[PDB]
Design a protein around this ligand. Sequence first.
Ligand SMILES: *[C@@H]1O[C@H](CO)[C@@H](O)[C@H](O)[C@H]1NC(C)=O
Lengths: 50, 44
Amino acid sequence: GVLTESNKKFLPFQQFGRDIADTTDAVRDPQTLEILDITPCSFGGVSVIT
Amino acid sequence: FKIYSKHTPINLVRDLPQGFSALEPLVDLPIGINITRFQTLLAL
Ligand SMILES: *[C@@H]1O[C@H](CO)[C@@H](O)[C@H](O)[C@H]1NC(C)=O
């Protein structure tokens, strides 16, 4: 996925944020205490008009 | 050993107020000891 700045709020030492499908949606960087939201990179179907 | 805490301001006199206030964790200690009985501590 892609990593981006997050406008979310966490606990003083919270770790990450899961979502409905049991897939991690955001993560806190272990080195520097910064939070990133994980968005899976683009995908979709392909249709050929002919 | 996990500790949860939140310090809310109330003006009630003698009863636990009606309301919701979740307690964020304060600290965790991996002591791994046995605790079955407990007692508080007070000042004078
Ligand atoms: C680990 O990295 C952080 C920031 O990159 C730094 O502040 C910290 O001092 C480092 N740890 C040690 C033990 O130097």
